[PDB]
């Protein structure tokens, strides 16, 4: 569609914000709050509905990992509960294939999931599928050519440079070439024939580096670094450009939104979020009403 939606996030505590940015005019619009605050969630879109998946409510009243799937209809500006996942998944990644949502990895307390499940909107049902070969929280996920990729994250002990691919017709995961950089909480998306991994945390520092995996050549190549180091950034693609939203730079919860032009191999600032935050869910769909 036409707007970049950012849902939830973290600053001091987990947030309920839903706001939409319009690249055509620079404008932000505040929309209906999530029913439950959450950070470390993912967003995605199916049939012009926006979905918020997993996360955790870090609050003064306590900390609750989320198994929730919630449905936002832009035509009505209302959130509806959808069926919950088998398990809470904080710092989750999601991918959409053929109108179905895959929920990948994430944590529940000290449990670091390798498990994966798939939601079918027409049935309002989740079903488990084959688990990843590695436990991954803070995992990045993207879809290219109807294959699902899980990239980086943290396995409970080490931050990971590894990545793997799920072949739905085989219900099977296989390792791909590892990244050149260890990354937990990177932004992962697809542009053209490449899976991009932007930023994240290597166990030491927040990263500004960006690298991309060419599915044909099976190699990762660095492109230009972002203007800001960031972990727990939101990422999405809007009209052939990658947008990265917020995150944490080791000092500040960023309001910076940056945009990547792959033809010039340059990042630039495009706007600021209305407030700095990390761990947001991001997706693109039609403008409301
Ligand atoms: C994902 C992640 C973990 C983390 O732990 C610490 C101590 N800092 C960070 C960060 O920026 O990002």
Contacts of residue 199, defined as CB under 8 A and 6 or more positions apart, other chains included, come to: 183, 185, 186, 187, 206, 207, 208, 209, 210, 226, 229, 230, 231, 233, 244, 247
Q: Which of 40, 31, 208 is nearest to 108 (CA)?
A: 40
Pocket-testing residue among 137, 185, 203, 250, ligand 1, by greatest number of atoms within 8 A of Cβ: 185
Distance between Cα 23 and ligand 1 center (Å): 30
Asked whether 206 lines ligand 1 (CB < 6 A), one says yes
Q: Which of 156, 141, 124, 136 is nearest to 89 (CA)?
A: 136
Expressed in percent and rounded to 5, the helix, strand and coil fractions of the chain are 0, 50, 50
Distance between Cα 32 and ligand 1 center (Å): 30
Ligand 1, atom 3, residue with closest C-alpha: 201
Instruction: For Cα atoms 23, 25, 27, give the angle at the middle one, nearest 5 degrees.
Output: 85
Q: How far is CA 234 from CA 92, 130, 134, 144, in A?
A: 12, 26, 23, 19
Distance CA 242, CA 76 (A): 28
Distance between Cα 277 and ligand 1 center (Å): 14
Name the CA dihedral angle for 66, 67, 72, 78, rounded to a multiple of 10 degrees. Answer: -70
Distance CA 137, CA 156 (A): 8
Distance CA 244, CA 282 (A): 9
Contacts of residue 60, defined as CB under 8 A and 6 or more positions apart, other chains included, come to: 13
Asked whether 154 lines ligand 1 (CB < 6 A), one says no
Distance CA 36, CA 41 (A): 12
Question: What is the resolution of the experimental data for this entry, in Å?
Answer: 2.0
Instruction: Kindly give the number of the ligand 1 atom that is closest to the alpha carbon of 201.
Output: 12
Does residue 188 contact residue 195 with C-beta atoms inside 8 Å? yes
Instruction: Kindly give the number of the ligand 1 atom that is closest to the alpha carbon of 138.
Output: 1
Distance between Cα 248 and ligand 1 center (Å): 8
The structure tokens listed for 55 are 């996360």
Distance between Cα 255 and ligand 1 center (Å): 18
Distance CA 137, CA 155 (A): 6
Superfamily holding 1-289: Kelch-type beta propeller (2.120.10.80)
Domain edges within the chain:
1-289
């Amino acid at each position: 569609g036409r707007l970049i939606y950012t849902a939830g996030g973290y600053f001091r505590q987990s947030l309920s914000y839903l706001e939409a940015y319009n690249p055509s005019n620079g404008s932000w619009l505040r929309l209906a709050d999530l029913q439950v605050p959450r950070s470390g969630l993912a967003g995605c879109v199916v049939g012009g509905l926006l979905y918020a998946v997993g996360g955790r409510n870090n609050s003064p009243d306590g900390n609750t990992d989320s198994s929730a799937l919630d449905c936002y209809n832009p035509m009505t500006n209302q959130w509806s509960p959808c069926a919950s996942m088998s398990v809470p998944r904080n710092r989750i990644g999601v991918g959409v294939i053929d109108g179905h949502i895959y929920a990948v990895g994430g944590s529940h307390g000290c449990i670091h999931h390798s498990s994966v499940e798939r939601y079918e909107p027409e049935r309002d049902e989740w079903h488990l599928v084959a688990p990843m070969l590695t436990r991954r929280i803070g995992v990045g996920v993207a879809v290219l050519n109807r294959l699902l990729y899980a990239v980086g994250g943290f396995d409970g002990t080490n931050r990971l440079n590894s990545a793997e691919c799920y072949y739905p017709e085989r219900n099977e995961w296989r390792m791909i070439t590892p990244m050149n950089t260890i990354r937990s909480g990177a932004g992962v998306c697809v542009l053209h024939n490449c899976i991009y991994a932007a930023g994240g945390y290597d166990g030491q520092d927040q990263l500004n580096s960006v690298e991309r995996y060419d599915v044909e050549t099976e190699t990762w190549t660095f492109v230009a670094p972002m203007r800001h180091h960031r972990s727990a950034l939101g990422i999405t693609v809007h009209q052939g450009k990658i947008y990265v939203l917020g995150g944490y730079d080791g000092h500040t919860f960023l309001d910076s939104v940056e945009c990547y032009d792959p033809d010039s191999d340059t990042w630039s600032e495009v706007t600021r979020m209305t407030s700095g935050r990390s761990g947001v869910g991001v997706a693109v769909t039609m403008e409301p009403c």
